[PDB]
Design a protein around this ligand. Structure first.
Ligand SMILES: NC(=O)C1=CN([C@@H]2O[C@H](COP(=O)(O)OP(=O)(O)OC[C@H]3O[C@@H](n4cnc5c(N)ncnc54)[C@H](OP(=O)(O)O)[C@@H]3O)[C@@H](O)[C@H]2O)C=CC1
Ligand SMILES: O=C(O)CCC(=O)C(=O)O
Ligand SMILES: O=C(O)CCC(=O)C(=O)O
Ligand SMILES: [N+]
Length: 419
């Protein structure tokens, strides 16, 4: 259902942004192709006793800066191109906030809503058994993503530890784990906290007081719900509309995120929430708000609605929710955009913190994680902002100049590319 191919779009963005920097042709060709792709068959036993084979992908795009990092997406509409694009974005995501990581991603073409608990556990364990040879605490560190949660992360960690015979830091093979089995404090609200920090910095740059303003959030998952909650709590914002895959609810007077979450859990969706009006995702994206945070499937803003966006700041919590064309239209409209791999870099940052805690065997507190995350996100955002201001270019491009250059430097320090 995607407007354009995700990997093609990602490559187009990379070229469009490399047009504003000095990079050799060979380095560009290296960066336009994932470094390793592994397609595996994942066989599991269903509840009725039959054996079903799913398709799994583990794509690492580059590991010049360090071990690759990226979540695992469970999605019926997933394609290898989507995983390649996500790994490519992961690379820039970890480069922009200066982490010793490369870019990676994983996925399974499956509808998890049709799978039971035992089937989900079997699927996670079989995926680990399939991709064990390309993952590790120093090779490839998976994490939670769309339709995956810390539960599945703990199952995957247990399977990896069983295969690995407890020879090294198995806890560090995967992030977003439960706190009991080597989890990190603040990882649950990581991406939301990073998005909130970036929104606050953007408002500071734009000279806008966020108290009493309006935020519309698309998607009510681990990122969308926590983003709405933190915006209502920390920034003093008024959440006027939320949504999920079945539709959204809008309220001019504001919504309480906890009640909406309870209604969603007790009914399966946020639709027909009391005191709110049912709308579509297309209608929510077009609402008159001060901040719009897409936290759902990619490619939600295209030439079919780019001119209808009326938000002062668009916080791309999701991975690649805006097309380059739509980026040009929004920039022509004077709308500030927080780039996708900079806005939601808080999640990968706290995942890096969890990995450090796991490999060192020493765990931090909430305050330390909160301070380090704030420091990293503020530095990265201000670097990207000053970059886009000095060169008079789009935000997305500027972050690329901040990110790709670092990656480029790594290759020149490894001898991968001579020029
Ligand atoms: N997973 C993570 O920890 C983080 C994720 N990201 C990126 O952010 C995005 C969202 O992740 P996350 O918040 O965890 O998602 P979740 O796994 O928590 O849940 C998905 C939510 O988004 C909804 N959704 C999926 N597709 C659509 C759609 N087309 N339209 C409207 N709502 C939709 C789902 O609806 P419903 O509930 O009805 O099924 C659900 O509400 C992803 O692209 C991800 O890669 C980066 C930061 C960390
Ligand atoms: O935290 C991680 O390592 C994965 C995060 C992720 O999947 C993403 O940022 O898209
Ligand atoms: O991402 C989550 O928080 C849970 C994902 C989910 O709802 C699912 O696996 O069906
Ligand atoms: N992230």
């Amino acid at each position: 259902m995607v407007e354009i191919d995700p990997f093609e779009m990602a490559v187009k963005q990379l070229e469009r942004a490399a047009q504003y920097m000095d990079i050799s042709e060979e380095a560009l060709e290296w960066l336009k192709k994932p470094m390793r792709i592994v397609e595996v068959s994942v066989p599991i036993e269903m509840d009725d006793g039959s054996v079903k084979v799913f398709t799994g992908f583990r794509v690492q795009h580059n590991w010049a800066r360090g071990p690759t990092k990226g979540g695992i997406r469970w999605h019926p509409a997933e394609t290898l191109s989507t995983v390649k694009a996500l790994a490519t974005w992961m690379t820039w995501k970890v480069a922009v906030v200066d982490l010793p990581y490369g870019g990676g991603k994983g996925g399974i073409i499956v509808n998890p809503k049709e799978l039971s608990e035992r089937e989900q556990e079997r699927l996670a364990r079989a995926y680990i058994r399939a991709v064990y040879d390309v993952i590790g605490p120093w090779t490839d560190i998976p994490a939670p993503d769309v339709y995956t949660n810390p539960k599945i992360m703990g199952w995957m960690m247990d399977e990896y530890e069983t295969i690995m015979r407890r020879k090294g830091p198995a806890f560090g093979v995967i992030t977003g784990k439960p706190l009991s089995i080597g989890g990190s404090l603040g990882r649950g609200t990581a991406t939301a906290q990073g998005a909130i920090f970036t929104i606050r910095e953007a408002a500071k740059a734009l000279g806008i007081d966020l108290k009493g303003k309006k935020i519309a959030v698309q998607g009510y998952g681990n990122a969308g719900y926590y983003t709405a909650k933190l915006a209502k709590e920390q920034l003093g914002m008024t959440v006027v509309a939320v949504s999920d895959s079945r539709g959204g609810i809008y309220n001019p007077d504001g919504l309480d995120p906890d009640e909406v979450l309870k209604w969603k859990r007790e009914h399966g969706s946020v639709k027909d929430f009391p005191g709110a009006t049912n709308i579509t995702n297309e209608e929510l994206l077009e609402l008159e708000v001060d901040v719009l945070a897409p936290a759902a499937i990619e490619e939600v803003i295209t030439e079919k609605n780019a001119d209808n966006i009326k938000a002062k700041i668009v916080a791309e919590v999701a991975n690649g929710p805006v097309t380059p064309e739509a980026d040009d239209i929004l920039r022509e409209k004077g709308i500030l955009q927080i780039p996708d791999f900079l806005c939601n870099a808080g999640g990968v940052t706290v995942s890096y913190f969890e990995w450090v805690q796991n490999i060192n065997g020493y765990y931090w507190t909430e305050e330390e994680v909160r301070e380090k995350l704030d420091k990293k996100m503020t530095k990265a955002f201000w670097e990207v902002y000053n970059t886009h201001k000095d060169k008079n270019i789009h935000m997305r491009d500027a972050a690329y100049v901040v990110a790709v250059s670092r990656v480029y430097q790594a290759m020149k320090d490894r001898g991968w590319v001579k020029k």
